[PDB]
Design a protein around this ligand. Structure first.
Ligand SMILES: O=P(O)(O)O[C@H]1[C@H](OP(=O)(O)O)[C@@H](OP(=O)(O)O)[C@H](OP(=O)(O)O)[C@@H](OP(=O)(O)O)[C@H]1OP(=O)(O)O
Lengths: 51, 574, 76, 58
């Protein structure tokens, strides 16, 4: 619930501002979120502290 | 291997005086078998069967008479003894055996069935009647009467079969099904006056209060089959009153099928809605927490155009089911159970002084110090504006922000004061909004946009300068964009240049260096872009090769669009 | 036949969301009504999961249930 | 395993346009107040289908 709130707020702001002649000063907030999400997806179970 | 199967399979696979003298050997075998075992009765039967075959039937009687002395409650033996006498064609003996059997065990059904069948196959049928008459004196339970009825029906005696039913209903008639089967018997023969009488007497028999309504539905459906349909409505409709909650569930399914033909305009919609109404009330008795059942119920009553006081009683019953969890995820469906009530009171009942009370009751129930529904505070505020009471509307939004300062409230309050042309009140609320949510750079922009729309440039500049001085922002890029774009709209490029200057003093990020060049490119001071590119490219000698490359592709775009081949050699040697 | 297919379907959701510990119990619960002698596509997709999102201590757990489950069918 | 992937979707801290230093919340509240109290107020603003089964019956 917290995640989808923050995401929808940020994406809506992106669609309002972007497409203007002085864009490119803005770090691509929706697409960079996509890029971050696909990078984080590779993950593994850690072993054990005792064994 | 030779495991379980092959060992045990191998173990498995290993696995006429002479006639008179033979008969003597058999008798000794039986008699000594009897002597030891006595309760052996299967062998006692076999000895009886065996002697019979020989025409020694005279002895076989003696065997069975001895066998009956051992058990006597012997129902296997009694059957075998009679059946022996029948196959021998002894029928007066067979009668005597049955007359004893039914006398001694009057409530073993098997003898009366077998005995009546023997006499019937002999066409003794007066005697077969007397057996059934004698049987009924024992008040034998259901199957005995049904077999006597069915017997008379095979003769087609049907008025004598009717006599059996009338006596059957006297003993058994506590069970409804006997009355319904009787009425069905009269109906199918065509006696239909008897069938009406049978149902009406069944209702009179069961009474007024403990209405046996399975009779009543059966009575209704019989009259429906006749095409009495006025009667059929009457029976269903009568049932609905005395039955009203629990048993009507059966009535309504037949009553609605009934009306589905004949009801078509007025009768169908009445029964289905009233069926639906009681069906939703069942859901509410099961779980008053079923909000979807209340919404669907309230839809039905509003489309009914139900009398106002009943719909108010249903809304106020629905509303009292406050969620037990006190966390907003559960309230999201429950809150529209209040909003629909305020919409009904405002739009349909048109009792505005009662819609105030709906909202006050709503806001007195929300756990505001844990969460709020901004919808409630917004809708309650706009309602008083429709009453032209700005003082009430401001108090509502004012305590909204005072109890729970929330973004949706600020936006709604600001949009309201903007529509009211109360621009100085909007300003004070934005300052409160920024104090609430300082990191929200969008609000700093929306605050500067208000000042820009009101034509006060120096107001808008002071906001932006105070905005970019903030220690934290959700999106400085959005704010720095907005302030550059503002100074571009002012055409004070010598200050917009200063914004890139200070922004570049904050970060040597290549995209800011590109946009600084693109700014000069869009002024058409293309040498400023080259001087920026050189200032970037000659200073960023320690930047990454791709960072420099992306920087220098932007310059290569600049020179390929302008076409200066001499500069492109410089670019080619960057 | 479809419950295995639904297990692959459900594991795909949990692995894109990253509930990889739940994904193993989806596969492991499906593995007991699968055999490595004809259902090789199930074992391949679990093996490709465990080499990606797994480690030695659970790869060997996969190979334990594999030899256990085949023994259930391979009565010869 | 921590499910990083969905947590990665809310993007934040896009670019280094900040000093990474902040005041305490009450005096940060005063910092806005004492700064935004400097905003001028130069002038006032005003800017002024068919029934046919039923049709034959009725
Ligand atoms: O808290 P905000 O950032 O101002 O978000 C609000 C608010 O959402 P919250 O659940 O986070 O409070 C509203 O939700 P409610 O408080 O009214 O329950 C929601 O309304 P809905 O739940 O009806 O969606 C509305 O969204 P909308 O304006 O589309 O109704 C949305 O506003 P944002 O669109 O600004 O996020």
């Amino acid at each position: 619930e917290q995640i989808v709130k923050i995401g929808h707020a940020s994406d809506s702001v992106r669609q309002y501002i972007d497409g203007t002649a002085t864009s490119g000063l803005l770090t691509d907030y929706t697409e960079s979120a996509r890029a971050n999400a696909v990078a984080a997806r590779t993950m593994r179970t850690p072993m054990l502290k005792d064994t | 291997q030779i495991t379980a199967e092959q060992l045990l399979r191998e173990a498995k696979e290993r696995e006429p005086d002479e006639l008179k003298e033979y008969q003597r050997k058999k008798r000794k075998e039986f008699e000594d078998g009897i002597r030891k075992n006595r309760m052996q009765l299967a062998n006692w039967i076999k000895y009886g069967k065996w002697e019979e075959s020989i025409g020694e039937i005279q002895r076989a009687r003696s065997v069975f008479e001895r066998a009956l002395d051992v058990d006597h409650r012997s129902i296997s033996i009694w059957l075998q003894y009679a059946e022996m006498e029948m196959r021998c064609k002894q029928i007066n003996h067979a009668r005597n055996v049955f007359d004893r059997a039914i006398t001694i065990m009057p409530r073993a059904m098997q003898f009366w069935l077998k005995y009546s069948y023997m006499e019937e196959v002999i066409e003794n049928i007066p005697g077969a009647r007397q057996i059934f008459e004698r049987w009924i004196e024992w008040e034998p339970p259901e199957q005995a009467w049904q077999t006597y009825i069915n017997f008379e029906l095979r003769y087609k005696e049907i008025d004598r079969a009717r006599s059996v039913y009338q006596r059957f209903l006297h003993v058994h008639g506590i069970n409804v099904q006997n009355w319904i089967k009787y009425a069905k018997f009269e109906e199918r023969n065509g006696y239909i006056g008897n069938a009406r009488a049978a149902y009406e007497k069944a209702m009179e028999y069961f009474g007024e209060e403990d209405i046996n309504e399975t009779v009543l539905v059966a009575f209704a459906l019989f009259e429906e089959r006749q095409k009495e349909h006025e009667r059929a409505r009457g029976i269903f409709k009568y049932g609905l009153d005395n039955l009203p909650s629990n048993r009507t569930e059966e009535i309504f399914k037949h009553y609605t099928q009934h009306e589905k033909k004949f009801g078509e305009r007025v009768g169908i919609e009445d029964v289905i809605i009233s069926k639906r109404k009681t069906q939703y009330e069942k859901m509410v008795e099961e779980n008053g927490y079923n909000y979807d059942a209340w919404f669907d119920y309230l839809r039905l009553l509003e489309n009914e155009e139900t009398d106002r006081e009943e719909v108010e009683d249903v809304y106020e019953r629905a509303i009292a089911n406050i969620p037990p969890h006190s966390e907003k995820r559960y309230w999201r469906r429950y809150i529209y159970l209040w909003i629909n009530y305020a919409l009904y009171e405002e739009l349909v009942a048109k009792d505005f002084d009662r819609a105030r009370q709906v909202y006050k009751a709503c806001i007195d129930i929300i756990p505001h110090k844990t969460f709020t529904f901004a919808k409630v505070w917004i809708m309650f505020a706009h309602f008083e504006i429709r009453q032209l009471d700005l003082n009430a509307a401001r108090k509502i939004m004012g305590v909204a922000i005072g109890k729970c300062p929330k973004d949706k409230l600020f936006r709604a309050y600001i949009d309201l004061e903007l529509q009211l042309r109360e621009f100085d009140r909007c300003r004070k609320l934005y300052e409160k909004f920024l104090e609430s949510s300082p990191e929200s750079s969008q609000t700093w922009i929306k605050f500067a946009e208000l000042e820009t729309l009101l034509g006060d440039t120096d107001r808008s500049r002071a906001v932006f300068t105070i905005a970019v001085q903030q220690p934290a922002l959700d999106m400085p890029e959005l704010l720095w964009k907005a302030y550059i774009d503002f100074e571009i709209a002012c055409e004070e490029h010598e200050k917009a240049r200063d914004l890139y200057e200070t922004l570049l003093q904050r970060t040597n990020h290549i995209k800011v260096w590109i946009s600084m060049a693109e700014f000069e490119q869009t002024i058409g001071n293309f040498e400023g872009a080259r001087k920026a590119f050189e200032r970037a490219n000659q200073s960023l000698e320690n930047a990454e090769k791709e960072e420099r490359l992306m920087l220098l592709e932007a310059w290569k775009e600049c020179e390929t669009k302008s076409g200066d081949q001499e500069a492109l050699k410089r670019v080619e040697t960057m | 036949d479809k419950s295995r297919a639904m297990s692959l379907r459900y594991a795909q959701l949990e692995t894109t969301v990253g509930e990889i510990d739940r994904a193993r119990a989806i596969y492991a619960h499906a593995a007991e009504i699968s055999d490595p002698k004809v259902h090789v596509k199930f074992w391949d997709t679990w093996k490709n999961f465990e080499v990606a999102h797994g480690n030695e201590a659970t790869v060997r757990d996969m190979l334990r249930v594999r030899r256990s489950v085949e023994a259930s069918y391979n009565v010869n | 395993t921590p499910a990083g992937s969905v947590a990665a979707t809310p993007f934040r801290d896009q670019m280094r346009i900040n000093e990474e230093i902040a005041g305490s919340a009450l005096e940060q509240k005063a910092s806005l107040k004492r700064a935004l109290a400097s905003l001028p107020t130069p002038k006032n603003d005003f800017e002024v289908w068919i029934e046919d089964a039923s049709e034959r019956a009725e």
